[PDB]
Design a protein around this ligand. Sequence first.
Ligand SMILES: CC(C)c1nnc(NS(=O)(=O)c2ccc(CCNc3ncc(C(F)(F)F)cc3Cl)cc2)s1
Ligand SMILES: CCCCCCCCO[C@@H]1O[C@H](CO)[C@@H](O)[C@H](O)C1O
Length: 261
Amino acid sequence: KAFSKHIYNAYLKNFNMTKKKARSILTGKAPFVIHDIETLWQAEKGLVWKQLVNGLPPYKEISVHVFYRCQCTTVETVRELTEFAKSIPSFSSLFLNDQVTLLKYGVHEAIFAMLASIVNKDGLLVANGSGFVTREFLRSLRKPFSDIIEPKFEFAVKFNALELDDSDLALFIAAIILCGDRPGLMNVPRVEAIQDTILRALEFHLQANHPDAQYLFPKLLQKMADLRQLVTEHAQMMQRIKKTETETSLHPLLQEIYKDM
Ligand SMILES: CC(C)c1nnc(NS(=O)(=O)c2ccc(CCNc3ncc(C(F)(F)F)cc3Cl)cc2)s1
Ligand SMILES: CCCCCCCCO[C@@H]1O[C@H](CO)[C@@H](O)[C@H](O)C1O
């Protein structure tokens, strides 16, 4: 009852952008549309970003610049997700190496679930909602960069059909991070103990918030499974980038996440 309230606060306290904020911008009541090099360059000059251009790896080309912008956003979400996880009382009681194991495997799964909030069929929100990058522009980048984001979109449209809100997402993301199936886990029974409480809290919240919902709890358990498949494909693509594109830098933190899978 109070656990669900605690998880939601931790979410609101740590994430820079809610699904409520993202949806109101996407619908209305105006973000700068990025669709080519001229608008992408304009966004760099005009728009206020978190990681300033000077902090990014040295300029190479358009496709690699977008890849670098994605790389920073990923790493920053990883930082926000580490603080959110710590904010769960049970999670911080686990030995730090088990905390790392959970984050090494759940992080991209959580990222893709939250990505659905800023994503629609035609593109996604950037620079704290100030800008909007089109899907066709990402489609226009050189291979393999044009092939990374496509399965995320295919997930995001199906996931947004469930119409979940920020209080549902807080528990969904919590359940993803606290997973007992992770390789190299030391105290697997304790992580399973936390997971069960989170999943029980999610079930009871999904009836209170979504009473007319047709099978919402088992649908979200299947969505967690689909998310694991999406991360596997992502690491595979990322490993291929490291072999083929031997001039584009991969952030050491992400290189470690992808190392095994
Ligand atoms: C090559 C490309 C398809 C990709 N490279 N890595 C990917 N990585 S990903 O894991 O799909 C991912 C995608 C998008 C975000 C926010 C992006 N944030 C963005 N921010 C700014 C711009 C820019 F520069 F165009 F304005 C574009 C995007 Cl997509 C976070 C993770 S997709
Ligand atoms: C393999 C996955 C491990 C990832 C851990 C991400 C950790 C969040 O670690 C952090 O980074 C910031 C600056 O670099 C700080 O301002 C925060 O107090 C902080 O805890």
